[PDB]
Motif scaffolding. Structure first.
Motif, short mmCIF file in Angstrom:
data_model
loop_
_atom_site.label_atom_id
_atom_site.label_comp_id
_atom_site.label_asym_id
_atom_site.label_seq_id
_atom_site.Cartn_x
_atom_site.Cartn_y
_atom_site.Cartn_z
N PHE A 240 0.83 -1.19 0.00
CA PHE A 240 0.00 0.00 0.00
C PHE A 240 0.87 1.25 0.00
CE2 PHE A 240 -2.57 -3.32 1.66
CZ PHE A 240 -3.85 -3.06 1.24
N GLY A 241 0.25 2.37 -0.34
CA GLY A 241 0.89 3.66 -0.27
C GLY A 241 -0.07 4.71 0.24
N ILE A 242 0.41 5.60 1.11
CA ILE A 242 -0.43 6.61 1.75
C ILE A 242 0.15 7.98 1.47
CG2 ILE A 242 -1.38 7.46 3.91
CD1 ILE A 242 -0.97 4.52 4.95
N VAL A 243 -0.70 8.91 1.06
CA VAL A 243 -0.32 10.31 0.85
C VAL A 243 -1.17 11.15 1.78
CG1 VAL A 243 -0.21 12.21 -0.79
CG2 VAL A 243 0.36 9.90 -1.53
N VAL B 34 3.00 15.85 2.24
CA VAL B 34 3.02 16.96 1.30
C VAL B 34 2.58 18.23 2.02
CG1 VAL B 34 2.73 15.56 -0.75
CG2 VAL B 34 0.72 16.31 0.52
N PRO B 35 2.99 19.42 1.56
CA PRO B 35 2.64 20.64 2.30
C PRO B 35 1.15 20.87 2.46
CG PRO B 35 4.23 21.12 0.55
CD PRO B 35 3.99 19.66 0.51
N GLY B 36 0.34 20.59 1.44
CA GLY B 36 -1.06 20.93 1.48
C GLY B 36 -1.87 20.05 0.56
N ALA C 113 1.65 14.09 -6.14
CA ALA C 113 2.42 13.10 -5.40
C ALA C 113 1.82 11.71 -5.57
CB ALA C 113 2.47 13.48 -3.92
N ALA C 114 0.49 11.61 -5.55
CA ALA C 114 -0.14 10.30 -5.72
C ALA C 114 0.17 9.72 -7.08
CB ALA C 114 -1.65 10.43 -5.52
N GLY C 115 0.28 10.57 -8.10
CA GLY C 115 0.61 10.08 -9.43
C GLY C 115 1.97 9.40 -9.47
N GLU C 116 2.96 10.00 -8.81
CA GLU C 116 4.29 9.39 -8.78
C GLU C 116 4.27 8.06 -8.05
OE1 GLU C 116 7.03 10.41 -10.29
OE2 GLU C 116 5.98 12.11 -11.19
N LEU C 117 3.55 7.99 -6.93
CA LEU C 117 3.54 6.77 -6.14
C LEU C 117 2.75 5.66 -6.81
CD1 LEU C 117 4.85 5.95 -3.50
CD2 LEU C 117 2.83 6.76 -2.29
N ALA C 118 1.76 6.01 -7.62
CA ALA C 118 0.92 5.02 -8.28
C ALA C 118 1.57 4.42 -9.52
CB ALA C 118 -0.42 5.64 -8.67
N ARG C 119 2.61 5.05 -10.07
CA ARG C 119 3.28 4.50 -11.24
C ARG C 119 4.30 3.43 -10.89
NH1 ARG C 119 1.78 9.95 -13.56
NH2 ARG C 119 1.39 9.53 -15.77
N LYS C 120 4.69 3.31 -9.62
CA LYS C 120 5.55 2.22 -9.21
C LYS C 120 4.80 0.90 -9.31
CE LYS C 120 8.31 4.94 -5.95
NZ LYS C 120 9.60 4.83 -6.68
N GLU C 121 5.50 -0.14 -9.74
CA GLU C 121 4.87 -1.44 -9.95
C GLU C 121 4.79 -2.27 -8.67
OE1 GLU C 121 7.60 -3.02 -12.84
OE2 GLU C 121 8.30 -4.59 -11.48
N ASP C 122 5.29 -1.76 -7.55
CA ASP C 122 5.28 -2.50 -6.29
C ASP C 122 4.10 -2.15 -5.40
OD1 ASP C 122 7.60 -3.90 -6.89
OD2 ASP C 122 8.89 -2.33 -6.06
N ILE C 123 3.30 -1.14 -5.75
CA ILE C 123 2.14 -0.74 -4.96
C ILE C 123 0.88 -1.23 -5.66
CG2 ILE C 123 0.80 1.18 -4.04
CD1 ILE C 123 4.50 1.61 -4.76
N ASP C 124 -0.10 -1.65 -4.86
CA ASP C 124 -1.36 -2.17 -5.37
C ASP C 124 -2.51 -1.19 -5.22
OD1 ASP C 124 -0.25 -4.61 -6.12
OD2 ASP C 124 -0.59 -5.49 -4.14
N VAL D 280 -8.78 18.72 -6.44
CA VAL D 280 -8.20 17.57 -5.76
C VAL D 280 -8.98 16.31 -6.08
CG1 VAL D 280 -7.79 16.55 -3.50
CG2 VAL D 280 -7.12 18.91 -3.93
N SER D 281 -10.31 16.37 -5.93
CA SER D 281 -11.13 15.21 -6.26
C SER D 281 -11.08 14.90 -7.74
CB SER D 281 -12.58 15.47 -5.82
OG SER D 281 -13.28 16.17 -6.82
N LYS D 282 -11.08 15.93 -8.59
CA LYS D 282 -11.07 15.71 -10.03
C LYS D 282 -9.78 15.03 -10.47
CE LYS D 282 -12.95 18.94 -12.58
NZ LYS D 282 -14.10 18.22 -13.20
N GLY D 283 -8.65 15.49 -9.93
CA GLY D 283 -7.37 14.94 -10.35
C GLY D 283 -7.19 13.49 -9.95
N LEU D 284 -7.60 13.13 -8.73
CA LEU D 284 -7.45 11.76 -8.27
C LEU D 284 -8.24 10.80 -9.14
CD1 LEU D 284 -7.53 11.96 -4.37
CD2 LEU D 284 -5.56 11.65 -5.85
N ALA D 285 -9.45 11.19 -9.53
CA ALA D 285 -10.29 10.31 -10.33
C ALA D 285 -9.66 10.03 -11.69
CB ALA D 285 -11.68 10.93 -10.50
#
Lengths: 147, 149, 158, 158, 149, 149, 147
Positions: A44-47, A82-84, A91-102, A125-130
């Motif tokens: 898992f990964g948490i932001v 992250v600051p805000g 930041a979530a985009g970078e962490l989601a491109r790794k192949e080790d996180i589900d 924020v909501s729009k980008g995550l989706a």
């Protein structure tokens, strides 16, 4: 505690997607795909943001507790600060491109109440995550709250 | 027989037929061409995505959708059912089904938490937007069987 | 049946939508052509002659009374401006939600010069934000820019 | 399915309507009986024991969610007060307009002691006079007086 | 003395006497006939139908009705009291009492919900309508002691 | 396929079947009896009464009613169509058809003049009331396909 | 002029009922029953009030003109006058029970406008006429107006 709930949703998507990508059924009945609530063997990964320190700490507290309590192994968690809230999607985009996180979990607190004059930062924020979830084909849970 | 689950299935069946006609051979000409879809479900493959909030209501809509497909000639062995926790995350599950080449249509069923009514909620906006973009990008019908509490 | 035909349909949103499609179709055909020699400011505008153009129409079936008068308004606009009834393709869909996806299929054909979208929208008796109406406008606008082909908006509120 | 059964239905209009029918059925059975000897003011009231009575229920299908909880409320009221499930006749009709005519057919049978009418009514979002709702109340009231058999009113507004 | 139950009882007594005189043969002539009812309840049988809903008020109304009948020479032995769940079923019970040949008059007592209706109320309109039609058909006085909360 | 003419025909077909079941032989017992009507129009005779105001609209509803009956197994030779000037006088025409023993149901179609909206109009009240009384008196379904302008 | 219209409605019910009570069709097609606009050989009856003399005279004027103009024979009209609108239903009942009349026409003027506090007299007049038509199975046209 939204933190506990957000982690639970992520656990049971990592299982569902694992089943869907696997071999299909034998036919002769209506295929039904399902996700269990066992977190063994999952990464898992948490932001999390850094605004309203008191509230966010409680939310990140629940997320980590939920993963471990449902059988997760605490060494399989990556935490990013992250600051805000405006900086969560990138930041979530970078962490989601790794192949080790589900799955990825987003924790944050928005500033204005539930009856504003409309909020541009909250929408982005909501729009980008989706969009990231659809584009990368990987679950991303949404665990923010409103002050 | 009059629930949103029933209606959503009909729209999915019809649109699936219509698309099959459009990309086939054209007409002979000499007159205005009119295209419309039939209500014959034979030979079609469907997928369904259902949330979990209000387990009582959602079960009813899902049963209606299955009943509608089979009654109109649908083969019960050609339905794939995927269940998801909440409304925020139907679109990502629907995307996975739509990308299979063995699925002709997708049906989305769910119930939304009616918050402060006059104002704008972000979960409802994102779920509807995500489904719309997926259909246009993948060129495949996606029906919106969602309701409000 | 003759009672239905006797009614007038000039000026309804079906008429205006078709008229805009004719002008835009001619305008693009001019832009793709060779540029002017120069020596003055160069102006473009679309003529209203509809002979030789191909059109597509997508219309929903909800509220079967209102829609029919709109569709017939569009057809007569094309015919009365020189178009032939053999160069119109009509597609009917269950509801307003699936207009954009059907309009996309028609617009990708190489034999179509413009597309007209017609429908009606249910107005709740208190003014909230409609999640269905916004998606139709958003989808149609994106398709035109991406495909580089004019699409006209001809819906109304009940 | 077990989720549906777990919900409580005590107290909904289906419950009250059935309870009134039980009391009225017993009350009439007492009135037809021999009068008291005298020597005091003579009072009548219906007991709430439902054993041995036959009931009929007429329910519309509009808004299939609300109605089912009302019908199940009526049935459990009869059963929990001593009635047998073999002595209930259920009739389903397309809409609220044709409840009175169906209720008339059931009420004319000699094997029925009371009739229960259940349904829901559409509320327009501005208060005008409803020509459908008034006819249901008017029809049911006339039938009871003419046939001399109690009929209970168990409808609600959306 | 000041409650609607008292007033309803007096009207029933007077109407019962008036009917008794009308059936008598007409006078010889030589003047204008005048018919009226007296306020003596001796030898008359009465029936009362009362609802239980909002019982706090009706007991005072039924109280007045019984008190008035006795005070004006009526014998308490001749009162039949019937109770019903709600106001919707007052007419059907009143009809059963009115068809007995041993009853001279019937008094109906009940309470109706607030009268600030938009334009109309569908339950109140049926109680008054049914009682009025019943009186004319059976040719026997029925008094309306109903009040609005 | 979604006009009031279509809906009215369905209700007439179903109620006609239901009445045929109720007065037939009863069940064997030992379980709760449930009665419901099918949607098989074979063997049934129908009559229709249509007004004339807004000739365009009424024609549409009448066509829908005929289409619904035939599509569900109805024999086009078993429809009697009676046309009338205005809404005030549908009930008298409907009464004549209902009294024939060769008719199993009656369908009434019309359009009303929307007058001053908030207030009470007498034509609309009488047309609805008249149809309701006829059905109860003659013991035969009468469907209300009427609409408003 | 409501008088002309009310008479026209009556003419084309006397014809319709005459057709319905006659022999049926030969089958093999959808039976359609219809009423023409020829008043030859028909007997009518008119009941008119006596309130707003100026208005009512114009209405009774149109009714008689309509019947004669459409081929009616003026000797086949029976006219009855009553003091007021409250007395129309009872008079119409007597005239409708005669076996020599085929339709009845009611002419009158109501007192209060179209936006009253509800009117009891107006309701009874319309209510009574409708019941008579159903009970006697004979058309009765409704040609009143509002001041």
């Amino acid at each position: 505690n939204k933190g506990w709930e957000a982690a639970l949703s992520a656990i049971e998507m990592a299982n569902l997607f694992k089943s869907l990508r696997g071999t299909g059924g034998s036919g002769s009945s209506m295929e039904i795909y399902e996700g269990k609530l066992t977190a063994e063997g999952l990464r898992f990964g948490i932001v999390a943001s850094r605004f309203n320190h008191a509230l966010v700490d409680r939310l990140v507290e629940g997320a980590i507790d939920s993963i471990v309590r449902h059988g997760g192994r605490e060494e399989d968690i990556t935490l990013v600060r992250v600051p805000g809230s405006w900086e969560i999607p990138v930041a979530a985009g970078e962490l989601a491109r790794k192949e080790d996180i589900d799955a990825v979990i987003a924790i944050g607190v928005l500033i204005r109440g539930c009856t504003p004059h409309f909020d541009y930062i909250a929408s982005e924020v909501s729009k980008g995550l989706a969009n990231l979830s659809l584009e990368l084909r990987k679950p991303i849970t949404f665990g923010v709250i409103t002050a």
